[PDB]
């Protein structure tokens, strides 16, 4: 597969109509996964499934600016399952990132970092076997 943590360059940043697809399998007994859309050292969009936060499964989304995390956005719809294959699709829309997992809409995250063409890397980390990571225009 691919080595995790994995860095996927996004040449020229992101733009509306760009679709990022991540395929992999959650490890048995996973604890956490993260996708980090990065603008240099800043994290424009952190998407962070947590499998055991006080015995609850939750997705935490946030932005990191100058090494400081901001206000978390939380989603208790939790489509991941330890040991199972998944597909994450992140569609860049004008106002938000739109995320679907296994072909079901999951959440939107409003753009806090607005220089979309500087969000030039995607980091993929945590407790997965990573099969592929790619992008296309729709
Ligand atoms: O806000 C989002 C932020 O949250 C804190 S935790 C937070 O701490 C505060 C302050 O104490 C509490 O108030 C919050 O209640 C709690 O949520 C995580 O450490 C951050 N994080 C996770 C990873 C990571 C790395 C590799 C793999 C992976 F899957 C995930 N790297 N950094 C990030 O998720
Ligand atoms: Cl975490």
Annotated domain spans of the chain: 1-138
Listed in sequence order, the residues at least 6 apart from 70 whose beta carbon sits closer than 8 Å to its beta carbon are 62, 63, 64, 112
- 70 known ligand binder: yes
Show the tokens assigned to 134.
Answer: 């790619």
Q: Give, as residue ranges, everything with CB less than 5 Å from ion ligand 2.
A: 32
Matching CATH number, 1-138, of 2.60.120.200, 3.40.50.150, 3.30.830.10, 3.40.50.2020 = 2.60.120.200
- Round to whole Å and give the CA distance between 74 and 59: 6
Which long-range contacts (C-beta less than 8 Å, at least 24 apart) are formed by 75-80?
A: 75/106, 75/107, 77/106, 77/107, 78/49, 79/104, 79/106, 80/26, 80/30, 80/33, 80/49, 80/51
CA angle 136, 113, 100 (to 5 degrees): 45
For 60, left (φ over 0), alpha (ψ -120 to 50), or beta? beta
Nearest Cα residue to 30 out of 84, 87, 91: 84
- The answer to whether residues 16 and 124 touch, using CB atoms and an 8 Å cutoff, is no
Residue to substitute in 69, 71, 72, 80 for testing ligand 1 pocket (most ligand atoms within 8 angstroms of CB): 69
- Round to whole Å and give the CA distance between 50 and 57: 6
Binding site membership of 32 for ligand 1 (Cβ less than 6 Å):
yes
- The answer to whether residues 113 and 10 touch, using CB atoms and an 8 Å cutoff, is no
Specify the DSSP class assigned to residue 83.
Answer: T
- 69 known ligand binder: yes
Listed in sequence order, the residues at least 6 apart from 53 whose beta carbon sits closer than 8 Å to its beta carbon are none
- The answer to whether residues 125 and 2 touch, using CB atoms and an 8 Å cutoff, is no
Give the largest Cα separation in the chain, rounded.
Answer: 40
Experimental technique, in short, is: X-ray
- 73 known ligand binder: yes
Residue 18 CA to its chain's centroid (Å) = 14
Binding site membership of 88 for ligand 1 (Cβ less than 6 Å):
no
- The answer to whether residues 131 and 25 touch, using CB atoms and an 8 Å cutoff, is yes
């Amino acid at each position: 597969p691919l080595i995790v943590p994995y860095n996927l360059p996004l040449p020229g940043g992101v733009v509306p109509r760009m679709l990022i697809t991540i395929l992999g399998t959650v490890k048995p007994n996973a604890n956490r996964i993260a996708l980090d859309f990065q603008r240099g050292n800043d994290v424009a969009f952190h998407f962070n499934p947590r499998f055991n936060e006080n015995n609850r499964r939750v997705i935490v989304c946030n932005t990191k600016l100058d090494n400081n995390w901001g206000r978390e956005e939380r989603q208790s719809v939790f489509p991941f399952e330890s040991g199972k294959p998944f597909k994450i699709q992140v569609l860049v829309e004008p106002d938000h990132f739109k995320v679907a997992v296994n072909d079901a809409h999951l959440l939107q995250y409003n753009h806090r970092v607005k220089k979309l063409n500087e969000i030039s890397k995607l980091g993929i980390s945590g407790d997965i076997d990573l099969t592929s990571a790619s992008y296309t225009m729709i």
